[PDB]
C-alpha cells in the first residue's frame, strides 16, 4: 500500500447471494464491508482478471488489518461476503480505469 | 489464493527490530507470525521487488484472515512485526525461485 491507488467511494450494488443465510447476514451487517477499493494503475495489467484478483487481495487485506488492529473480527461468513462485495467494486473500477486509460482523444 | 503457490516451511531468521519494544514483543509472541509464504510463480515478475510486494501482501492477507475468522486479533505492533518477518522470507523465496527458474542446465 504505497504503489497503490485508492479509488473513489462509489454507489454499492446490492450483491446477490444464493445462500439465504449469506444474504441475511450481509443485509444485517452491510456497513462492515468496504466502500472504496485499492488497486494498482491499470497500465500494469494485461486484462481485467489480473486487475480484479489484485484489487480484491489488496482491498480485503487492508480492510481486515484495519479491523483486526481495532480489536474487532470477521467471521468466515463475513469473509465470503466481503470478497464478493469487493469483487464487484473492483470490476467497476477496472472498466472505468481501463477505458479512461484506453481513451484516445485528440 | 488459487493462482498461488505455497512455498516450503523454512528456517526463520531472528529479524532485527531497532525499536526495543518491537524486539521484545516479537520475541515474546514469535510463534504467531507466519512460517511459510504464498506467492505467484517467479516468471510473472520482472524483478525481486514486484515479487516481494506481492508475496508480502498475499501472505499477510491470508494469515490475518485465518486469525480473524478464529476469533483472534493482531495489534498494530503485531502487523509491523509480521510484514518484516514475512518480507525476509519472501526475499529468500525470490532468490530460490528466481535462480531455480533462470538456471540453464543442459
Curated annotation (Swiss-Prot), chains A, B:
It is found in: Cell membrane; Golgi apparatus. Glycans are attached at residues 57, 73. Disulfide bonds join 55-90. A lipid is attached at residue 106 (GPI-anchor amidated alanine). It comes from the Eukaryota. Belongs to the prion family. The normal, monomeric form has a mainly alpha-helical structure. The disease-associated, protease-resistant form forms amyloid fibrils containing a cross-beta spine, formed by a steric zipper of superposed beta-strands. Disease mutations may favor intermolecular contacts via short beta strands, and may thereby trigger oligomerization. Its primary physiological function is unclear. Has cytoprotective activity against internal or environmental stresses. May play a role in neuronal development and synaptic plasticity. May be required for neuronal myelin sheath maintenance. May play a role in iron uptake and iron homeostasis. Soluble oligomers are toxic to cultured neuroblastoma cells and induce apoptosis (in vitro). Association with GPC1 (via its heparan sulfate chains) targets PRNP to lipid rafts. Also provides Cu(2+) or Zn(2+) for the ascorbate-mediated GPC1 deaminase degradation of its heparan sulfate side chains. It is linked to Found in high quantity in the brain of humans and animals infected with degenerative neurological diseases such as kuru, Creutzfeldt-Jakob disease (CJD), Gerstmann-Straussler syndrome (GSS), scrapie, bovine spongiform encephalopathy (BSE), transmissible mink encephalopathy (TME), etc. Scrapie is a transmissible neurodegenerative disorder of sheep and goats. Most sheep that contract the disease naturally die between 24 and 50 months of age. The incubation period in sheep depends on the strain(s) of the infecting pathogen, sheep age at exposure, and the sheep genotype. Scrapie can be spread between flockmates, or it can be transmitted from an infected ewe to its lamb. Monomer and homodimer. Has a tendency to aggregate into amyloid fibrils containing a cross-beta spine, formed by a steric zipper of superposed beta-strands. Soluble oligomers may represent an intermediate stage on the path to fibril formation. Copper binding may promote oligomerization. Interacts with GRB2, APP, ERI3/PRNPIP and SYN1. Mislocalized cytosolically exposed PrP interacts with MGRN1; this interaction alters MGRN1 subcellular location and causes lysosomal enlargement. Interacts with KIAA1191. This protein is produced by a bicistronic gene which also produces the major prion protein/PRNP from an overlapping reading frame. The alternative prion protein/AltPrP (AC F7VJQ3) and PRNP have no apparent direct functional relation since a mutation that removes the start codon of the AltPrP has no apparent effect on the biology of PRNP. In mouse and hamster, the alternative initiation AUG codon is absent and is replaced by a GUG codon. This is Major prion protein. It comes from Ovis aries (Sheep). The gene is PRNP. The chain holds residues 128 to 233 of 256 of the full protein.
